[PDB]
Design a protein around this ligand. Structure first.
Ligand SMILES: CCCCCCCO
Length: 157
């Protein structure tokens, strides 16, 4: 079964646990390129009553660095916010809980904004069919494939 965090049947407890960054996409490509602040490799999501604790690592000069963030529920069901290189809000438009999680995020910094979309998998990679469904979701948000970066060959430390 599949759900969206904004849907009535969403079960947030089911996204708890191990996740890996498979693909990142953005309408401001520099944010997810090699030294971008948003080129983040997810490791796990810990579901709490009104928040999510996100564990990531960043990479630089082939060196990993851990980082944890707390995302708080906002007034809209299925939406969370977190302060990181500006103000961010995100939702999960589509997940099947057992294989993939597709997230959509809006960042606001210095009076500007950009969209980030991420495809996360329970394993370190996903099938080509799920990757295509993700490309279709990015297209629905005005993000060209040339702005979609598959990181499945670089998500391990
Ligand atoms: C629990 C999913 C983390 C949201 C990250 C934003 C998509 O790149």
């Amino acid at each position: 079964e599949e759900a969206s965090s904004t849907g009535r049947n969403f079960n947030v407890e089911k996204i708890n646990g191990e996740w890996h960054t498979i693909i990142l996409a953005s309408d401001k490509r520099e944010k997810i390129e090699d030294n971008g602040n948003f080129r983040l490799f997810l490791e796990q999501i810990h579901v709490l009553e009104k928040s999510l604790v996100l564990k990531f690592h960043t990479v630089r000069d082939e060196e990993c660095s851990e980082l944890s963030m707390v995302a708080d529920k906002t007034e809209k069901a299925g939406e969370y916010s977190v302060t990181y290189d500006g103000f961010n809000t995100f939702t999960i438009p589509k997940t099947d809980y057992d294989n993939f999680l597709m997230a959509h995020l809006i960042n606001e910094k210095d009076g500007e904004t950009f969209q980030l979309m991420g495809l996360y998998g329970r394993e370190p990679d996903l099938s080509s069919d799920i990757k295509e469904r993700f490309a279709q979701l990015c297209e629905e948000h005005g993000i060209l494939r040339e702005n979609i970066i598959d990181l499945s060959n670089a998500n391990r430390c």
